[PDB]
Amino acid sequence: MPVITLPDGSQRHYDHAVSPMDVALDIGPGLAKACIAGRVNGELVDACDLIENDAQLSIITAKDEEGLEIIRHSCAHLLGHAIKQLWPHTKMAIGPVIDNGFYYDVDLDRTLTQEDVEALEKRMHELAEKNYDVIKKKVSWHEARETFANRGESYKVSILDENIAHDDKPGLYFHEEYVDMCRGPHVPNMRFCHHFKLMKTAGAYWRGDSNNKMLQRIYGTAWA
Numbered sequence: 001m002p003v004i005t006l007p008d009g010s011q012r013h014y015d016h017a018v019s020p021m022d023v024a025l026d027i028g029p030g031l032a033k034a035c036i037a038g039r040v041n042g043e044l045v046d047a048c049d050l051i052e053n054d055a056q057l058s059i060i061t062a063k064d065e066e067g068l069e070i071i072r073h074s075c076a077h078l079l080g081h082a083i084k085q086l087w088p089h090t091k092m093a094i095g096p097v098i099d100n101g102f103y104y105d106v107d108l109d110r111t112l113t114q115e116d117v118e119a120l121e122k123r124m125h126e127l128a129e130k131n132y133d134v135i136k137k138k139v140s141w142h143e144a145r146e147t148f149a150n151r152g153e154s155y156k157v158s159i160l161d162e163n164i165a166h167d168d169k170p171g172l173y174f175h176e177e178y179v180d181m182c183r184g185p186h187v188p189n190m191r192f193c194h195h196f197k198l199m200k201t202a203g204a205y206w207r208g209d210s211n212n213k214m215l216q217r218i219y220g221t222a223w224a
């Protein structure tokens with residue numbers, strides 16, 4: 001029975017757990033449509049995350065700096081979704097947000113040509129324009145590892161084996177048949193990710209160690 005207080009001081013009493021999206025829809029259709037994520041007691045959370053206890057809630061939209069960062073991060077997931085369709089054997093490493101954009105380091109046997117990059121961007125636009133929902137599932141360290149092992153995603157498994165505590169609960173984000181892992185938040189639907197472009201590619205050693213494989217870094221930019 002969390003008591004939710006909004007920035008304006010208005011309060012809402014609930015006798016069941018509610019998500020930022022649930023509260024946004026209670027306020028109005030416009031706010032629900034604009035909702036990308038929420039901030040609960042100072043912490044950024046996905047719009048679908050349940051609030052069980054009393055809390056201060058704010059709704060994050062594309063007009064917020066946090067909203068732009070989330071859109072950029074979700075565009076990295078979109079790149080993965082598309083590249084796994086074009087070259088299924090590709091292995092995804094790390095895809096973070098950077099100042100004015102994002103990048104994703106990938107392991108695939110073909111050295112990407114400019115035509116390949118253009119094909120990748122084209123597929124990304126096609127997929128994003130389907131306006132599919134991003135489905136989030138909070139899971140155990142072990143379920144996350146099984147999920148990526150079953151996909152042959154060795155770098156994701158390595159991140160779990162060496163960089164994530166066994167008691168941590170990773171967030172899995174499903175984009176149709178594609179799945180990625182992140183602390184998030186991520187957009188609730190890809191309709192928020194139509195404005196982006198791929199830029200250049202570069203090379204980067206996995207974990208910055210020259211004893212490891214040289215990956216391909218694909219750079220992109222995205223905006224509201």
Ligand SMILES: Nc1ncnc2c1ncn2[C@@H]1O[C@H](CO)[C@@H](NC(=O)[C@@H](N)CO)[C@H]1O
Nearest residue numbers: 076094095096164168170171180181182183
């Ligand atoms: N404790 C944790 N729980 C959930 N996700 C975690 C995590 N520690 C690291 N990550 C994710 O692993 C990738 C490399 O840091 C990062 N994510 C990614 O590279 C893809 N989502 C592409 O954006 C990062 O979010």
